[PDB]
């Protein structure tokens with residue numbers, strides 16, 4: 301925004317440069333994918349296999 | 357009743373890896389992910405069993421024992437006041453060399469109780 305709102309261009313909304321935040325949130329997904337695949341796999345495996353009482 | 361001791365433990369062989377891998381579950385911990393998947397082995401300088409096999413241990417042990425014993429050897433106005441010198445020959449009385457197998461009469465515990473209670 302400091303580079304965007306420099307001269308005659310004011311301080312309205314008017315700024316879609318979503319590439320930076322887009323990269324930031326996709327690099328979040330890059331690492332959250334194993335964690336959520338493991339967590340959702342255990343969720344589905346407990347729902348369809350049952351809970352093991354004193355197994356571990 | 358409710359509050360009771362054990363008098364026998366729980367036996368193993370009936371859960372998660374015991375006979376049929378508990379019939380092949382699809383549940384796994386985060387502590388069960390791959391980690392340290394490579395056994396490190398002893399190198400030639402460390403203590404590899406090729407080097408340990410030919411070694412005479414008694415001569416080297418006696419030499420290190422001799423060197424340790426040699427190191428331990430080479431290491432080692434108002435005259436009118438109503439009370440005179442009360443400590444004449446008290447040359448610090450080596451309590452800090454003694455070690456006592458008693459948690460109530462130890463030196464560390466006496467220092468502890470001297471420090472932490474006023």
Ligand SMILES: O=P(O)(O)O[C@H]1[C@H](OP(=O)(O)O)[C@@H](OP(=O)(O)O)[C@H](OP(=O)(O)O)[C@@H](OP(=O)(O)O)[C@H]1OP(=O)(O)O
Nearest residue numbers: 301302303304305306309310311312313314315316317321
């Ligand atoms: O109100 P300020 O502290 O001066 O800062 C605001 C605030 O952004 P910050 O998070 O940096 O404070 C606004 O964000 P909101 O949290 O209010 O949504 C933002 O507007 P948008 O983020 O909605 O675009 C706006 O930007 P601008 O007013 O330049 O359009 C920006 O103002 P400054 O850039 O003057 O700090």
